[PDB]
């Protein structure tokens, strides 16, 4: 879309309808008359358009009203309510922009942000823009968290986030205009290469892939239409479901054969009954011919009875010869009907070992996309976020993704090498106890009005806990933490001195030997300016390959590449890097997935802030003190950068509303 309505789409909002969040802030309008609403919606959309058309400068209420028309610019308290609402929830003026009105003289309220991942940084920038005292505590020696970017010489490769998943509605599309991001499209095509090192034929390729998608759609049918979602009390995984589908597909292949051969024996048994009849007729024709012959040996003259006997036997024979000719007719029809059925048999097998191997690569792809064994994904919900995916080509940050968190970090109080150990929240406020990662006995205490926690789900999962909450987090929250899935996927960076692969092909697969190793080095990326190949380790294999040294991994890398490109066409890699996210103490995995027994609803539970008990018993209900942002908190955009980004924006708004008050609700 384009124009005013396109801005609403780009901002993930329906252009012609008021959202649930809008209904909360403008309950007068939404319950009011249809005319008012359309005015409101326009004002909203028009303001968004303005900010979007130029996101490198702050959009003020002045500048907004300036560029509005009649009758829309007549009511200025409406325009102000709109502008503020949008600015509060980071729909306008977010990221890196030049401020027209320099920051307020002095700050209001104090917020400690745990972790300087993208969600953290996003929220921090916002809160500071709202004029609050903000300090981030990063355990690492760098910003970005799960946005890691390897750099050496001219080699640049992302060990974490890498792909901008389409600009159509992406808040990152805004960010990319604010930051020097070199965005390059990824060409869809991905040729496969079997264990031998030779390409899968386009005949096979196209119609294994087809079967894959067909098998997926099948599981969806099991899930929704058949409601196959519980089995022995345990929730059904996607893996379980796929297995069941494949089995039912193998069963059908056999059922076809059985009823086909069963049709042959029913015709083969008709032929048997006919041949028996034909033999018994040739028996009696043999006998009757003899009798007629003997009757014709009686030379004339003969009396009438003896004359009749010759005539009789003649008739009786041509009668039986008539029948046999009609039976030889029937034999001719059934004899070709047997050659009919035996000519075109049904499918021999559902999939061969060679087929099933290529299909396992497609499962590995799915296991990569979810960063987890398909036996862990929720059947019903694994894809619950589908309706919200952005439009457009997927792109790669060619100059490295780190450029984004780094750029966001500018002008922020970030305490690097500071590992939070304990969060203490009470009715009167919060203290955060952290240590120095280097000399771990050196302690820090932080006092604040509110704590925003952007700790990765894998961290919140640790047992025994890496961070202690005082008081303990409520049962509903910890249940959500356990229920949810935190996955794992690793990357192998190979830096060569020369390009030896197809320069116009961005990615190519490798089909592994067994199901067990289907994710092991199953995919390779050529994206960057420099000659760098990037190899993915996914699924079950991801977890195990962490116990294996770099040399051994880089070995297996070259082994596969040699088999594909030539034993002497693959040189020794100048620089090599291997990720270990599950081992990394500040991640404990890669990103989240909807685990079996979980749902999208859990992601909402994660976002719900914690309100402490009262100090003095019988004193009023306190303020919410402990807030959560992060990739694992955003139901509609989990496991992404923009997801984290938006969660950050979200919490900042909620915190600001809480501590600076919402003026825009009159």
């Amino acid at each position: 879309p384009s124009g005013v309505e396109g801005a609403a789409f780009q901002s993930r909002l329906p252009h012609d309808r008021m959202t649930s969040q809008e209904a909360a802030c403008f309950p007068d309008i939404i319950s009011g008359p249809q005319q008012t609403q359309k005015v409101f919606l326009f004002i909203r959309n028009r303001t968004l358009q303005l900010w979007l058309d130029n996101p490198k400068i702050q959009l003020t209420f002045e500048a907004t009203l300036q560029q509005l028309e009649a009758p829309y610019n007549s009511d200025t308290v409406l325009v102000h309510r709109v502008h503020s609402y949008l600015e509060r929830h980071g729909l306008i003026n977010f990221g890196i922009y030049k401020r027209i009105k320099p920051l307020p003289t002095k700050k209001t309220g104090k917020v400690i942000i745990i972790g300087s991942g993208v969600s953290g940084l996003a929220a921090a920038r916002q809160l500071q823009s709202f004029g609050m005292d903000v300090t981030l505590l990063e355990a690492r020696d760098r910003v970005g968290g799960r946005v890691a970017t390897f750099r050496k010489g001219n080699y640049v490769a992302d060990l974490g986030a890498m792909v901008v998943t389409g600009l159509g509605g992406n808040p990152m599309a805004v960010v990319s205009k604010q930051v020097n991001m070199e965005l390059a499209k990824i060409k869809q095509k991905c040729p496969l290469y079997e264990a031998n090192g030779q390409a899968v034929p386009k005949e096979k390729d196209e119609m294994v892939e087809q079967e894959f998608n067909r098998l997926l759609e099948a599981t969806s049918y099991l899930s929704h239409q058949l409601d196959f979602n519980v089995l022995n009390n345990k929730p059904v995984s996607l893996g379980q479901a796929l297995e069941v589908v494949i089995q039912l597909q193998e069963k059908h292949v056999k059922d076809e054969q059985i009823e086909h051969w069963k049709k042959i024996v029913k015709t083969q048994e008709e032929l048997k009954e006919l041949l028996n009849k034909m033999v018994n007729l040739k028996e009696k024709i043999k006998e009757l011919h003899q009798q007629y012959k003997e009757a014709s040996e009686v030379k004339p003259p003969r009396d009438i009875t003896a004359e009749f006997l010759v005539k009789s036997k003649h008739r009786d024979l041509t009668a039986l010869c008539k029948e046999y000719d009609e039976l030889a007719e029937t034999q001719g029809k059934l004899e070709e009907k047997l050659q009919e059925l035996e000519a075109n048999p049904p499918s021999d097998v559902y999939l061969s070992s060679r087929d099933r191997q290529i299909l396992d690569w497609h499962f590995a792809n799915l296991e990569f996309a979810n960063a987890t064994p398909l036996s862990t994904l929720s059947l019903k919900h694994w894809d619950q976020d589908d309706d919200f995916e952005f439009t457009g080509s997927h792109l790669t940050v060619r100059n490295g993704y780190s450029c984004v968190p780094v750029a966001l970090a500018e002008g922020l109080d970030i305490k690097l090498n500071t590992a939070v150990r304990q969060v203490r929240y009470t009715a009167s406020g919060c203290e955060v106890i952290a240590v120095n990662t280097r000399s771990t006995s050196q302690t820090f205490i932080y006092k604040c009005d509110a704590v925003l926690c952007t700790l990765p789900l894998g961290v919140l999962k640790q047992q025994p806990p890496a961070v202690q909450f005082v008081p303990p987090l409520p049962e509903w929250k910890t249940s959500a933490v356990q229920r949810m899935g935190f996955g794992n996927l690793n990357k192998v960076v190979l830096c060569f001195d020369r390009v030896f692969w197809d320069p116009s092909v961005n990615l190519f697969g490798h089909v592994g030997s067994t199901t067990a190793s289907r994710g092991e080095l199953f995919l390779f990326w050529n994206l960057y300016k420099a000659p760098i190949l990037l190899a993915l380790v996914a699924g079950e294999a991801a977890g195990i390959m962490e116990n294996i040294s770099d040399d051994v991994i880089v070995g297996r890398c070259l082994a596969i590449l040699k088999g594909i490109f030539g034993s002497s066409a693959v040189p020794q890699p100048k620089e090599t890097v291997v990720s270990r996210w599950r081992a990394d103490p500040w991640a404990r995995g890669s990103y989240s997935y909807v685990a079996a027994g979980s749902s999208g609803n859990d992601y909402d539970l994660m976002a719900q802030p914690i309100t402490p008990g009262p100090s003095i018993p019988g004193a009023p209900q306190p303020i919410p003190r402990l807030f959560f942002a992060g990739e694992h908190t955003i139901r509609n955009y989990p496991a992404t950068v923009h997801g984290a980004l938006l969660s950050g924006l979200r919490e900042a708004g909620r915190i600001a509303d809480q501590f600076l008050g919402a003026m825009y609700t009159l």
Partner: peptide, 6 residues
Amino acid sequence: PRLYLV
């Protein structure tokens, strides 16, 4: 999620 599928 499904978004990353190659």
